[PDB]
Enzyme design. Structure first.
Site, PDB file in Angstrom:
ATOM      1  N   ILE A 160      -1.734   0.544   4.576  1.00 28.43           N
ATOM      2  CA  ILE A 160      -1.316  -0.502   3.661  1.00 28.43           C
ATOM      3  C   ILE A 160      -1.619  -1.899   4.164  1.00 28.43           C
ATOM      4  O   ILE A 160      -1.164  -2.882   3.554  1.00 28.43           O
ATOM      5  CB  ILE A 160       0.197  -0.447   3.328  1.00 28.43           C
ATOM      6  CG1 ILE A 160       1.022  -0.685   4.583  1.00 28.43           C
ATOM      7  CG2 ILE A 160       0.550   0.863   2.724  1.00 28.43           C
ATOM      8  CD1 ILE A 160       2.394  -1.157   4.244  1.00 28.43           C
TER       9      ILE A 160
ATOM     10  N   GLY B  71      -4.948  -4.340  14.793  1.00 28.84           N
ATOM     11  CA  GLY B  71      -4.578  -3.012  14.318  1.00 28.84           C
ATOM     12  C   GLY B  71      -4.254  -2.743  12.837  1.00 28.84           C
ATOM     13  O   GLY B  71      -4.162  -3.649  12.032  1.00 28.84           O
TER      14      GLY B  71
ATOM     15  N   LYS C 299       2.600   0.092  12.701  1.00 28.00           N
ATOM     16  CA  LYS C 299       1.409  -0.715  12.946  1.00 28.00           C
ATOM     17  C   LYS C 299       0.818  -0.088  14.181  1.00 28.00           C
ATOM     18  O   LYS C 299       1.525   0.082  15.149  1.00 28.00           O
ATOM     19  CB  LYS C 299       1.825  -2.174  13.185  1.00 28.00           C
ATOM     20  CG  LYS C 299       0.696  -3.119  13.509  1.00 28.00           C
ATOM     21  CD  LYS C 299       1.227  -4.509  13.696  1.00 28.00           C
ATOM     22  CE  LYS C 299       0.096  -5.518  13.757  1.00 28.00           C
ATOM     23  NZ  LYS C 299       0.686  -6.880  13.982  1.00 28.00           N
TER      24      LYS C 299
ATOM     25  N   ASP D  30       0.400 -17.844  13.306  1.00 24.80           N
ATOM     26  CA  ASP D  30      -0.264 -17.167  12.220  1.00 24.80           C
ATOM     27  C   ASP D  30       0.622 -17.157  10.976  1.00 24.80           C
ATOM     28  O   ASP D  30       0.715 -16.172  10.259  1.00 24.80           O
ATOM     29  CB  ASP D  30      -0.638 -15.748  12.687  1.00 24.80           C
ATOM     30  CG  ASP D  30      -1.692 -15.063  11.802  1.00 24.80           C
ATOM     31  OD1 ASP D  30      -2.434 -15.787  11.091  1.00 24.80           O
ATOM     32  OD2 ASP D  30      -1.783 -13.797  11.843  1.00 24.80           O
TER      33      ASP D  30
HETATM   34  O1  LIG Z   1       6.811  -3.500   5.164  1.00 28.18           O
HETATM   35  C1  LIG Z   1       6.164  -3.952   6.113  1.00 28.18           C
HETATM   36  N1  LIG Z   1       6.670  -4.090   7.435  1.00 28.18           N
HETATM   37  C2  LIG Z   1       5.656  -4.672   8.192  1.00 28.18           C
HETATM   38  C3  LIG Z   1       5.753  -5.063   9.611  1.00 28.18           C
HETATM   39  C4  LIG Z   1       4.675  -5.656  10.196  1.00 28.18           C
HETATM   40 BR1  LIG Z   1       4.731  -6.287  11.969  1.00 28.18          BR
HETATM   41  C5  LIG Z   1       3.441  -5.836   9.424  1.00 28.18           C
HETATM   42  C6  LIG Z   1       3.362  -5.475   8.130  1.00 28.18           C
HETATM   43  C7  LIG Z   1       4.508  -4.852   7.461  1.00 28.18           C
HETATM   44  C8  LIG Z   1       4.762  -4.438   6.072  1.00 28.18           C
HETATM   45  C9  LIG Z   1       4.045  -4.454   4.966  1.00 28.18           C
HETATM   46  N2  LIG Z   1       4.636  -4.109   3.720  1.00 28.18           N
HETATM   47  C10 LIG Z   1       3.722  -4.275   2.690  1.00 28.18           C
HETATM   48  C11 LIG Z   1       3.885  -4.086   1.357  1.00 28.18           C
HETATM   49  C12 LIG Z   1       2.722  -4.356   0.458  1.00 28.18           C
HETATM   50  C13 LIG Z   1       1.528  -4.764   0.983  1.00 28.18           C
HETATM   51  C14 LIG Z   1       1.364  -4.956   2.456  1.00 28.18           C
HETATM   52  C15 LIG Z   1       2.440  -4.711   3.261  1.00 28.18           C
HETATM   53  C16 LIG Z   1       2.662  -4.821   4.698  1.00 28.18           C
HETATM   54  N3  LIG Z   1       1.832  -5.152   5.600  1.00 28.18           N
HETATM   55  O2  LIG Z   1       0.562  -5.489   5.539  1.00 28.18           O
HETATM   56 CO   LIG Z   2      -4.377 -10.966  11.952  1.00 24.92          CO
END
Ligand SMILES: O=C1Nc2cc(Br)ccc2/C1=C1/Nc2ccccc2/C1=N\O
Ligand SMILES: [Co+2]
Ligand SMILES: O=C1Nc2cc(Br)ccc2/C1=C1/Nc2ccccc2/C1=N\O
Ligand SMILES: [Cl-]
Ligand SMILES: [Cl-]
Ligand SMILES: [Co+2]
Lengths: 348, 348
Positions: free
Chosen positions: B28, B34, B51, B147
């Site tokens: 996702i 990563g 991740k 970031d």
């Molecule tokens: O629910 C999430 N916990 C995360 C913790 C980290 Br650290 C990085 C991302 C996420 C994350 C993500 N949830 C999403 C829902 C829709 C589209 C992309 C993401 C996403 N990420 O791209």
């Molecule tokens: Co990045």
């Protein structure tokens, strides 16, 4: 629209103020160095481009200064230039009246990408070859473009001629004197620029030109990335991690960073299967971490990838002849005479 | 898909290896640090995010190191982490099992932009307020995110809660020690980063957060630009040219550049007509050339723009209550106690 009449000076040649009238003005480009309009010269009917930048009048315009100096079939020609004013006081504009070209590699590439297809390899050779030829030309004056990207490469779809344009960021690099590292369009920045280098050389145009070649073979930018860290990661995934030596050749003072994982990737596992071996070879020889290890522009024109262009029979896909590609002047080849034997075919 | 069982360690708390099984793995997200998958914890049915980054094993992972240290309602929680290997030898992966959140500000903003509309100002206040609160939190540990961008801001559409995530580029800044200037997503880079600064501070997160606020009010990035020169030109068109002083506060060693034309533009002529005065005020106080002149994150939460959130009646547009916004801990406000009188409403 309305007719406009100004006193203009010719770009090249004797400085003799002359009267110019043009009409049918429409906008066709924007930039951080001004607007570009298309226009029609009244009395000759010819279409031209006019780029209008705000001018300090207290400082020379380097774009104009450089453009006046150039003259090569692969660089857009400056016809005249004139000043004008705006609604507000103490607000003068410099206007560059240049040749008008119908298309740009950026559009031709987008058009094909949209059609879910790749640009015919013959066009790839023709466009890239002319880009390198121009690049060699301006470098021989010690001028580095600093903004080589598809939108600055003009094309005439019919004749297949390419013309380098937009010298807004161009500059004559001098050893020892520093240069900003924030010029150049994201996707085309040489690693040394991403690393902060301020002592870089004209070879940054070659890295860019290489990014263009690769983009034309892939159908999308080869090194995308939101941050410089991401671009560096894309680059490392194709060239492998930089040796400490290399990182030093890119930017002496540098500041170490994390990174790591993956190294020395399949340059052939990058492009589609049908991608010509030689096209990939040229890319490797163009996208090199060490800047001095990158082919020079003239050596690029002499690369095997461009052999088809030297072929006696070669014709554009539309049966017409190919543009000028061998009319090298002695001055043009003086930087590396030996290349003449490959540059100029036997039947010439 | 298949079921996977690993020995994991809890993020926070006692280091006690425990067994974890998860399934329904799908990708996702991607990144230069990563891949991010969604997954379901078997025995509890809960959805989590995992991740997976390649790890050197010979070097600690700073993302993990930082994440272990945090714990705040506006920062995504690390549940466990574990290592795993790949098809190839000497190839270990670090896996971070984090809370899963349904949406991200980036999508919510794109969704609205697509619908040709702007995000309801109440959401703007709620999202931005929580972003600043988190920002104050991590800064108090001397950690700069580096970031901040809409894709790293997770949202739960129903509860309206925001959670900062992706500490891939995060770092604890120390005076005197240099930092690379090539981190941070293009559109959100503070001027000092564009200028090459390596002695910048946590205030770069504030400039970004300001870019986010402005993007949420305009419907598109406020400072687009292919090259850094173009971004600088966009920025100058809104803040005016930088005084020599300012350029020095951004990057001591800097290297001069051309630029010039236009200066001190209408901050109000930037956004749509209906744009709330206070929203524009906050932006000006956030997008400042001089970094120390930018509001701090906690002062941002105390700004008038966020008064509606302090209102006793306030309710999400869906009648539900608003998320946690005033439960400040004494440790949280210790950086500027006086703010307590505005931060914590009377009815608290
Ligand atoms: O629910 C999430 N916990 C995360 C913790 C980290 Br650290 C990085 C991302 C996420 C994350 C993500 N949830 C999403 C829902 C829709 C589209 C992309 C993401 C996403 N990420 O791209
Ligand atoms: Co990045
Ligand atoms: O025909 C041209 N001569 C130029 C000289 C300079 Br210098 C800069 C641009 C042009 C230029 C342009 N021709 C175009 C045709 C289609 C879309 C954009 C352009 C363009 N420009 O954006
Ligand atoms: Cl010829
Ligand atoms: Cl609360
Ligand atoms: Co430009």
């Amino acid at each position: 629209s309305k007719v406009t009449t100004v006193v203009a000076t010719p770009g090249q040649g004797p400085d003799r103020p002359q009267e110019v009238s043009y009409t049918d003005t429409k906008v066709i480009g924007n930039g951080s160095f001004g607007v570009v309009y298309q226009a029609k010269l009244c009395d000759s009917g010819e279409l031209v481009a006019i780029k209008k930048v705000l001018q300090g009048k207290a400082f020379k315009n380097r774009e104009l200064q450089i453009m006046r100096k150039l003259d090569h079939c692969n660089i857009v020609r400056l016809r005249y230039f004139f000043y004008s004013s705006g609604e507000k006081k103490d607000e003068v504009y410099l206007n560059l009246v240049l040749d008008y070209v119908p298309e740009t590699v950026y559009r031709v590439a987008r058009h094909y990408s949209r059609a879910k297809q790749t640009l015919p390899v013959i066009y790839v050779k023709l466009y890239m070859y002319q880009l390198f030829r121009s690049l060699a030309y301006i470098h021989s004056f010690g001028i580095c473009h600093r903004d080589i990207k598809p939108q600055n490469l003009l094309l005439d779809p019919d004749t297949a001629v390419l013309k380098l344009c937009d010298f807004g960021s161009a500059k004559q690099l001098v050893r020892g004197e520093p240069n900003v590292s924030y010029i150049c369009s994201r996707y085309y920045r040489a690693p040394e620029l991403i690393f902060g280098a301020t002592d870089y050389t004209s070879s940054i145009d070659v890295w860019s030109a290489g990014c263009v070649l690769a983009e034309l073979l892939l159908g999308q930018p080869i090194f995308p990335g939101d941050s410089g860290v991401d671009q560096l990661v894309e680059i490392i995934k194709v060239l492998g991690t930089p040796t400490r030596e290399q990182i030093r050749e890119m930017n002496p003072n540098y500041t170490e960073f994390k990174f790591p994982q993956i190294k020395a990737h399949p340059w052939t596992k990058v492009f589609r299967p049908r991608t010509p071996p030689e096209a990939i070879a040229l890319c490797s020889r163009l996208l090199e971490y060490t800047p001095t290890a990158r082919l020079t522009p003239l050596e690029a024109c002499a690369h095997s990838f461009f052999d088809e262009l030297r072929d006696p029979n070669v014709k554009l896909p539309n049966g017409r002849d190919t543009p000028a590609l061998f009319n090298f002047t002695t001055q043009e080849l003086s930087s590396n005479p030996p290349l003449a034997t490959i540059l100029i075919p036997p039947h010439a």
